[PDB]
Design a protein around this nucleic acid. Structure first.
Lengths: 50, 112, 91, 100, 63, 77, 50
RNA sequence: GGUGAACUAUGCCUGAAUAGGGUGAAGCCAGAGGAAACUCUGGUGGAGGCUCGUAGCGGUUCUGACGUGCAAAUCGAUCGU
RNA sequence: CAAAUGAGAACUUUGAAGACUGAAGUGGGGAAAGGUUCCACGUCAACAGCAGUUGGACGUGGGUUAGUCGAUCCUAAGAGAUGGGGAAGCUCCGUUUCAAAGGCCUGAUUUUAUGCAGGCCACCAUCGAAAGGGAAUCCGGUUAAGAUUCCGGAACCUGGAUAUGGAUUCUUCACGGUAACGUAACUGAAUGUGGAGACGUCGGCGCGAGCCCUGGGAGGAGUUAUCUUUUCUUCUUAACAGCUUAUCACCCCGGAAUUGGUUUAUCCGGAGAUGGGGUCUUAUGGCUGGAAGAGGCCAGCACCUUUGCUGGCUCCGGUGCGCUUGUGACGGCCCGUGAAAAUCCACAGGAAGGAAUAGUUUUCAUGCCAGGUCGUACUGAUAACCGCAGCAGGUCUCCAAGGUGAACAGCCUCUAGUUGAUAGAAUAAUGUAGAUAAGGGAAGUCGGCAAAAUAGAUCCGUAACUUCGGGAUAAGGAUUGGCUCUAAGGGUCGGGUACGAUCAACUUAGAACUGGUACGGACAAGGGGAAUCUGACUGUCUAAUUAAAACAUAGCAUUGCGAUGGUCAGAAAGUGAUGUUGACGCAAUG
């Protein structure tokens, strides 16, 4: 909604900050198996439903 | 014809959300927001509209000077002239009735 | 002008509810919508607001009275009875 | 109220370009301007005059710059001067014909 | 052009009526116009003194 | 905004020592078609109000603008 | 929700300067601005509270 | 031992929405008839859990479409209000 | 269709056409919900059930600015601590009740001090609405995106502080008016009271705003074989300040039946009407200031130089059963009479205080400071929400142009928006949807199922039966086009001391002429009648096979109960519903 509360605004801010692809240098760190951000979200795909 | 829209976030035709369609110096029509109308203060005795007193909202009464909220007569901004006159007449006549009743009681007690 | 023979005010109800019920409702509806004399001012200005509320608009007064009449026969009878009892007690 | 209205038309540019003749222009105005909607009512109430380079019309009866523009456009369309001549207003009732 | 034709009175026949008489022009508003015209005339006559108040009252009730 | 029609009241307003700026607006106004006159408006800017003094006489306007002290910030337009 | 009218009546507080409003059940014939009397020594009139 | 009245059922509190017509109740105005009792005729007026019919709400029939569907109940026409 | 971009174009962009939504929109915003989906730049591996150069996709960044809009404050339905009482206990009841329930003012004026020589009460937590109540902002401009939030101008409210302008001193807290009352002001504590907040719905009438329509004039655009003083378009004035303007109501003067006045609607008048005069309300309107300097409509001159500057205009009207909205005076309806509270004023009362350079007013004017915190982007739906999805489903609301027409019906168009649904190839059978058909006319079939016929409006006519209200649009018939006319509708202005011009045009009739006897020419729009069963009707239910004769219903009847009670809750309770109730009531039934 347009008329939100600060808690919901903070939750959306955290979701926006988390919703980014993983940096490419963590791919290059040794003894690492992470290749992609498995916790990636899209507004159409998955609703956080807060 | 140009069509207008609410300026506030309220989308409903509630009482606190009235709108008038006004043309502005820009040549376009916009929905200015009109609010509750004021009702005239009423007499505490007869309930009729108190003439001589401005009709505003209570906070506008707070910000308005004393002259517009009252009349120079006794019970100025509370009761109407007819009610004030009727209660003055009632007061005087009932006091006179009480005095004559008191003297009648005194004289009959003295006689008996 | 008589537009209807016998339904009177109950022409609004038209055909439904039955003739006897409509006749009773008619009698009580004329009684409740009639204009009554005001015992204080003498003008035919007493209307009914609700059952037992009868307002005289000319002199700005309200009276307690029957649901469909300004004064019921029972009210008049008890008025006479209490008047008689008060007079007997006083004298 | 009854004051005469004066309308000026500057045809200097088309006259210099030599494709448009003020004499025939004002003749067209004097035979096509209609007052009261018919003929025989143009009894010196509306007059047209040519100095050779400017056409001056004087009207005590009803006459408007809108009408003057309409008649000028009709004449230009008849003589195929459109897309070459524009009927422009400089100030009130002081129209001119431009080439650009 | 059509409005000018209607003003002259064309296109107003039974084959052009689609609404009822009252739907087209209310008998109530026709009566209102009639009574207002008659009351205004009666008041004008009474004020001018052509007819006195008693005849005016009788005519007002008749109107 | 507040209308001003009295020369002495305008003088007291400019003497108020709270107002500093006055805008002299010149208008071309028509009362009769044959007399297009030079209306002018002295808009004194107060702290809560803009007082617009109206005059329609060029001579009176000139006399007033000459009588205005030079300390007051006058803006002519 | 009640078939009978109610009466807003006003008495004087005998112990403190103020007015006391009471909600009576209106008897037939009781009119506005009328003297009713409540008490042991009241007179037998319609509306009194003997 | 806990969870649910975001669907739905019902009751409250607070808001909002509902073209055009038809019929013509009470209440009034003016006349006509008659010896009376009374009766009658025009107009006004605008009532109704009235009526035709939009928006809306619902879902009669085609036992129409679809029936591995647009859809785990929809679409069209026809319908009730 | 063409062009551009591109490796590649049915799908992208631009232009040109053709169309549609047709103002209860496919337009412009919002509520819930979503949460960045908004916007820019790169960009096509996957997704957009064809493609893609495009995207609500991927990558990187930008974007949401408030004293005035909301929240915050108040209380409603209700939720819920405390005292207290239950429960083994998680916890339950209870919200004022069986409680010792408590905070602001001139203030004593200097080491003290809401300890003080002083004062009054009685809501007796709190939460609960982004649609109820409510202090205050408008215009113009500005961005890739924010704006009633930014900028420019012009205002207002709340809180605080405080000094100058204006009335009295040997009449301390004004004056005038007959009176309704009027001023720029014109002391007023406890205490009490009143008002505003504060209210339903429908019908007609009146007025206003906006829009629609229309005349002249100024400026552009379209047609111009022919005709159109022609068709379209701009001509606009915000919050706020001052003055002036109404119904209703009220006051003074005479004192009225020969009753008068008066509304569309019949209601008032010796409890004082007509008449004359006056007072009051800020809805509303008008004139100014804001403010033309703004914004729009034009013409002209410099000229990769985040590009500019001048000139003119922006003016007068009119009409109405017009549409919508608001308002006002009213009428109708109820066994229905259509929240509270916060908050703000005012009035009674007179506490205390006040006088010739010293005091009384910050409810008169001007002047000073501040106004915190969170939301603000976008969609709001045949693609941003829910339905597993970019699902023909569902989902609350505001504004609503022209023509036809009774009509926010159907049909066409203007503003705005879209042109989105995998495409191509004259289409066999059978389908789905839409339609015609000679003669017969239900012979079909369980059954006239489905289709057809009817249909608007104006006249004529209308039966049985009836609860007299209906039946009823009963049943039946006749007309309807175009053109040229004719007649009924309607305001001001007087006689030195029996009488008539301008001025909307919108509803009815009548006539002539005319044509392929066509005319509600498309759209749109009842088939009817004679009876039986059944349910009185209006209404309600088996969401997703049964809308019915089932259920409700008013009506009728029976039963219980007088409060230490009836009916029913709770494990219990100093616990509950009916009950803010009391037999014209509540409860249980048919």
């Amino acid at each position: 909604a347009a008329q939100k509360s600060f808690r919901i605004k903070q939750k959306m801010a955290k979701a926006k900050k988390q919703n980014r692809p993983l940096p490419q240098w963590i791919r290059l760190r040794t003894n690492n198996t992470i290749r992609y951000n498995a916790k990636r979200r899209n507004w159409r795909r998955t609703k956080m439903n807060i | 014809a140009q069509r207008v829209t609410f300026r506030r976030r309220n989308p409903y035709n509630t009482r606190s959300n009235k709108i008038k369609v006004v043309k502005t110096p820009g040549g376009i029509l916009r929905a200015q927001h009109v609010k509750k109308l004021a009702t005239r203060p009423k007499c505490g005795d007869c309930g009729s509209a108190l003439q001589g007193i401005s009709t505003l909202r209570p906070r506008q009464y707070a910000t308005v000077s004393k002259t517009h909220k009252t009349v120079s007569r006794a019970y100025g901004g509370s009761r109407c002239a007819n009610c004030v006159k009727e209660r003055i007449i009632r007061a005087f006549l009932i006091e006179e009735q009480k005095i004559v009743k008191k003297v009648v009681k005194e004289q009959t007690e003295a006689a008996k | 002008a008589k537009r209807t023979k016998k339904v009177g005010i109950t022409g609004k109800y038209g055909v439904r509810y039955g003739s006897s019920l409509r006749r009773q409702v008619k009698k009580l509806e004329i009684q409740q919508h009639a204009r009554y004399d005001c015992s204080f001012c003498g003008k035919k200005t007493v209307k009914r607001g609700a059952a037992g509320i009868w307002t005289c608009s000319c002199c700005k007064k309200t009276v307690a009275g029957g649901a469909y009449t300004v004064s019921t026969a029972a009210a008049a009878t008890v008025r006479s009875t209490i008047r008689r009892l008060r007079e007997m007690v006083e004298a | 109220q009854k004051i005469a209205k004066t309308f000026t038309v500057d045809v200097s540019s088309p006259t210099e370009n030599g494709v448009f003749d003020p004499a025939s222009y004002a003749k067209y105005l004097i035979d096509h301007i209609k007052v009261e909607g018919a003929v025989g009512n143009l009894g010196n109430a509306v007059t047209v005059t040519e100095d050779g380079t400017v056409v001056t019309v004087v009207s005590t009866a009803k006459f408007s710059g809108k009408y003057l523009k309409y008649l000028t456009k009709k004449y230009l369309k008849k003589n195929q001067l459109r897309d070459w001549i524009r009927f422009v207003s400089t100030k009130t009732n002081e129209y001119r014909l431009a080439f650009y | 052009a059509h409005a000018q034709s209607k003003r002259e009175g064309r296109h107003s026949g039974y084959g052009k009526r689609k609404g009822t008489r009252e739907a087209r022009l209310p008998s109530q508003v026709v009566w209102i116009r009639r009574l207002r015209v008659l009351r205004r005339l009666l008041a004008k006559y009474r004020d001018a003194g052509k007819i006195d108040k008693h005849l005016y009252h009788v005519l007002y009730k008749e109107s | 905004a507040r209308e001003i029609t009295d020369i002495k009241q305008f003088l007291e307003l400019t003497r108020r020592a709270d107002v500093k700026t006055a805008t002299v607006k010149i208008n071309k106004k028509l009362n009769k078609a044959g007399k297009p006159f030079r209306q002018t408006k002295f808009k004194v800017r107060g702290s809560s109000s803009l007082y617009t003094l109206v005059i329609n006489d060029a001579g009176k306007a000139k006399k007033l603008i000459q009588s205005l002290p030079p300390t007051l910030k006058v803006n002519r337009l | 929700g009640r078939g009978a009218p109610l009466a807003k009546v006003v008495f004087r507080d005998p112990y403190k300067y103020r007015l006391r409003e009471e909600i009576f059940i209106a008897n037939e014939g009781v009119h506005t601005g009328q003297f009713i009397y409540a008490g042991k020594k009241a007179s037998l009139n319609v509306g009194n509270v003997l």
